[PDB]
Design a protein around this ligand. Structure first.
Ligand code: FE
Length: 249
């Protein structure tokens, strides 16, 4: 029925040790806006308390998913918040904000940090912070799968998360042998990153396993497209797809 997306590339994350308290991996490398629009980068971090300093951002949004550990968030608009395993935060930097992500004492945080571009029209928007607890997100419940919607929608199940650039961000937990479908508008650009397990993906049943990012084929605006996911092992993954900004970076 719907146009079936393909996996156009499979990236295997190569982690490096930054310091005794910090390891990291590039999932989406920086400086390739033209391929990843609206995304600017996606970084995997494993870190302890004291790793990061306070830093400004402007003209972007950052989206953190905590895989494990307890994270303390600060920003200069909203102040302090916390995140635990499975939780997300969405920080719109806009005209400017400073932030710091710091693990709780004795905790090691494993996280995924996504940057989303802001279009010129919104680069100077007021900073805003959204704390997105896993338990508060809507979920598509299917036989053998749950699809938790952190942003955008999945088969009409819509997160209330405020977006500037429309972004669909979903967490899938899929039992072995179960097939799940994610709908995407044809002009969205996206990928998924596998946290746990393995499966086959897209029109050609391309294999993917934990620690890999699988990038989606591009289609036309106005087309209804779908991505098929079949678990082989117990599968946990994050899918990110968004509307390209299409502006010189
Ligand atoms: Fe930062």
């Amino acid at each position: 029925m719907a146009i079936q997306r393909r996996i156009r590339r499979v990236k295997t994350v190569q982690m490096t040790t930054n310091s005794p308290i910090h390891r990291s991996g590039s999932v989406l490398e920086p400086g390739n806006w033209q391929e990843y629009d609206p995304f600017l980068l996606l970084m995997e971090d494993i870190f302890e308390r004291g790793t990061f300093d306070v830093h400004p951002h402007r003209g972007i949004e950052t989206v953190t998913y905590v895989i494990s550990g307890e994270l303390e968030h600060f920003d200069s608009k909203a102040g302090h918040s916390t995140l635990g395993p499975g939780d997300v935060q969405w920080m719109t930097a806009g005209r400017g904000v400073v932030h710091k992500e710091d693990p709780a004492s004795g905790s090691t945080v494993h996280s995924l940090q996504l940057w989303v571009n802001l279009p010129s029209a919104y680069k100077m928007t007021e900073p805003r912070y959204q704390n997105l607890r896993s338990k508060d997100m809507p979920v598509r419940k299917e036989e053998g799968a749950t699809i938790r919607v952190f942003s955008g929608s999945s088969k009409g199940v819509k997160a209330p998360t405020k977006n500037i650039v429309p972004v669909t961000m979903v967490e899938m937990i899929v039992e072995p042998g179960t097939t799940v479908v994610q709908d995407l508008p044809g002009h969205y650009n996206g990928f998924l990153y596998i946290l746990e397990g393995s499966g086959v993906f897209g029109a050609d049943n391309i294999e993917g396993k934990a620690g890999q990012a699988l990038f989606f084929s591009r289609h036309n605006r106005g087309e209804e497209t779908e991505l098929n996911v079949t678990a082989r092992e117990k599968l946990r993954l994050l899918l990110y797809a968004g509307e390209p900004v299409n502006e010189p970076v």
